[PDB]
Symmetry: D2
Subunit: 112 residues, 4 copies
């Protein structure tokens, strides 16, 4: 299992959100360096979001480009995109960050 | 009044209006219905408790959200959404919001 | 097996283990118990349907989370958390996760 | 009713999260631009978070400094902070962004 997985469930259809761009960024100085970008697969997943580069401890941000996702469906959303910031304090462990998504609401958490 | 509920449709970011919500008390066997009402235009029922003092114990509100979506020609995972909660202090304000989507929801103790 | 559930404790970011979960079917305004089990160390019940053929209908899983918290001397707003859902298609997989805190939760149809 | 209100509910206590720093930023051309900073009162609320300048349409973000909030209680959290990004498409509307907060999970939405 990859250090970082993400997935998106669309709570309006009760199905995965497919083909959503998701970026990964590392905090550095007062900003953020992009480490990767990928798109959720047909099951709404990116099982392995970390690039082929050793992960270091630090703070990271995943950005779910959900605004574009909704825009392709002619749907408005309150959020142009959804950033989620989290600590990686242990590079030996698996980090899983699902997104439960609606147009005007969402939930995120550390999964298993 | 010791019990308020509201429903926010997370798909529209607007209140769910005219949704039937029931209130029940847990009895020794089964439940007893205390009240029924409908959310107003702001998705609220400000005063869901009937005109009777509350006692400590378990209660259940049931948001009839399947009907609400059906009127929109929309399918939902849930026929309805029961929320069971515990009243421990009887003169305290209890607030049970529902953040609703067709295939997902959240509830909590509100302010 | 057509029904899985899991519970994630949003306060620890870890699964909720050894939580009792019942499954019931709706019948005549009541509910018939069909099975009961305990989430494993991963907070999962992979196969909650009993070993009889599934039928269409409405069903209710009840996560005994008030008991889960009480074991840890933690109070909860909710003595248990019922989730009601349609089964329209008997051949498909139904997955009902619970994101759990003492005074709030979320549930949805998972993948 | 104010262009921007936020509040926080601690889902672990079922009570408001108090004295939590919240910043407001606009997505300006030169990067994100701080507009205001403020603290939830005892009720976990900031009922007017907009500064004393006219609002324009555009993208904005509030950052709830919840990592600090938990750190004061000797509690760990997955998130150092929680940014929430959103569109203001109509300046004469009221935007309300609640946060339902747990150590390893949160929800947010456009409230009323
Ligand atoms: Br995944
Ligand atoms: Br209300
Ligand atoms: Br499972
Ligand atoms: Br507020
Ligand atoms: Zn996943
Ligand atoms: Zn960190
Ligand atoms: Zn995982
Ligand atoms: Zn894992
Ligand atoms: Zn309310
Ligand atoms: Zn009770
Ligand atoms: Zn209230
Ligand atoms: Zn209150
Ligand atoms: Zn599961
Ligand atoms: Zn049904
Ligand atoms: Zn499943
Ligand atoms: Zn499945
Ligand atoms: Zn508020
Ligand atoms: Zn915008
Ligand atoms: Zn408001």
């Amino acid at each position: 299992q990859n250090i970082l997985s993400v997935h998106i469930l669309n709570q309006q259809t009760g199905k995965p959100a497919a083909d959503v761009t998701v970026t990964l960024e590392k905090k550095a100085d007062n900003g953020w360096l992009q480490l990767n970008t990928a798109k959720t697969d047909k099951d709404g997943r990116i099982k392995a979001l970390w690039p082929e580069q050793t992960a270091t401890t630090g703070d990271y941000r995943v950005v779910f480009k959900t605004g574009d996702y909704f825009k392709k469906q002619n749907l408005e959303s309150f959020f142009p995109e959804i950033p989620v910031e989290f600590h990686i304090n242990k590079v030996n462990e698996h980090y899983h960050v699902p997104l439960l998504l609606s147009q005007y609401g969402y939930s995120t958490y550390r999964g298993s």
